[PDB]
């Protein structure tokens, strides 16, 4: 399938080169998979989700997304125009308040929830979690993300945005999951993106257009924006049978475009996520 005049990040992750404008992908488009956007929520009524997005859990008086961050991240996963995995089932878990803040306890519980909730949802091709959030180093947050990952949920986390090594951030610094840095439309590392050995992969992160609350769209930048490409790719590749949860970060590493990026400091993988589609 071909979606013309696509958001640059979708076209990039189906391309071997920069500056192209058509997103290429297999029409199965992640059908039968499930992604948990663990974030501020999802405006599940947005026309762009087509009834494929539900709110499953909140730790606040409301489950509505009153900030916008989660709706954007969810759209890159699977909105009809701005998403990588245009047929995936989107489940929202609101752990962050409408100001974008959340206590670590809340964040651990929410990962625990998804570890159990997946056994109540039909996701026969696989389950993916996207964590576009992070804070300072926490062994417990890291342990909680390990525990998800181990419960057979491919877990994709944001590297963070301080332009520093990701070893001093969580859950970014957990070796067992998939830590995602950001790159721009000219194949540079984003200047704000963290870096280091714990990164697994870079996906598109600068000036990312996606769904926003009120049935609106907008562009924003971050690893928080990079992480949803890879989860949706993780969810897309699992539906094609190519890979499992236990192993999708490694598979996405092996088949990623190599050496394309500049602005990468020594000790960090030069690997930009690629979907490997040949029509």
């Amino acid at each position: 399938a071909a979606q013309t005049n696509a958001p640059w990040g979708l076209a990039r992750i189906s391309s071997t080169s920069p500056g192209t404008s058509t997103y290429y992908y297999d029409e199965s488009a992640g059908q039968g998979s499930c992604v948990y956007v663990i974030d501020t929520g999802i405006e599940a009524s947005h026309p762009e989700f087509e009834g494929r997005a539900q709110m499953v859990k909140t730790y606040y008086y409301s489950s509505r997304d009153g900030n916008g961050h989660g709706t954007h991240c969810a759209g890159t996963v699977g909105s009809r125009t701005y998403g990588v995995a245009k047929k995936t089932q989107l489940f929202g878990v609101k752990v962050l308040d409408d100001n974008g803040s959340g206590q670590y306890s809340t964040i651990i519980a929410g990962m625990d929830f998804v570890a159990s909730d997946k056994n109540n949802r039909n996701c026969p091709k696989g389950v993916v979690a996207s964590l576009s959030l992070g804070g300072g180093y926490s062994s417990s947050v890291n342990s909680a993300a390990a525990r998800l990952q181990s419960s057979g949920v491919m877990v994709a986390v944001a590297a963070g945005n301080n332009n520093a090594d990701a070893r001093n951030y969580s859950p970014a610094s957990e070796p067992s999951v998939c830590t995602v840095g950001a790159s721009d439309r000219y194949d540079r590392r984003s200047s704000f993106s963290n870096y280091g050995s714990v990164l697994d992969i870079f996906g598109p992160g600068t000036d990312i257009l996606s769904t926003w609350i009120g049935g609106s769209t907008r562009s924003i930048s971050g690893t928080s924006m990079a992480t949803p490409h890879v989860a949706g790719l993780a969810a897309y590749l699992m539906t094609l049978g190519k890979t499992t949860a236990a192993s999708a970060c490694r598979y996405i590493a092996d088949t990623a475009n190599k050496g394309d990026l500049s602005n990468i400091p020594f000790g960090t993988v030069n690997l930009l996520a690629y979907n490997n589609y040949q029509a």
């Binding site: 974008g100 576009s132 959030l133 992070g134 804070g135 944001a158 945005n161 971050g222 690893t223 928080s224």
Partner: peptide, 6 residues
């Protein structure tokens, strides 16, 4: 501690 949107 408090975590935050990235």
């Amino acid at each position: 501690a408090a975590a935050s949107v990235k």
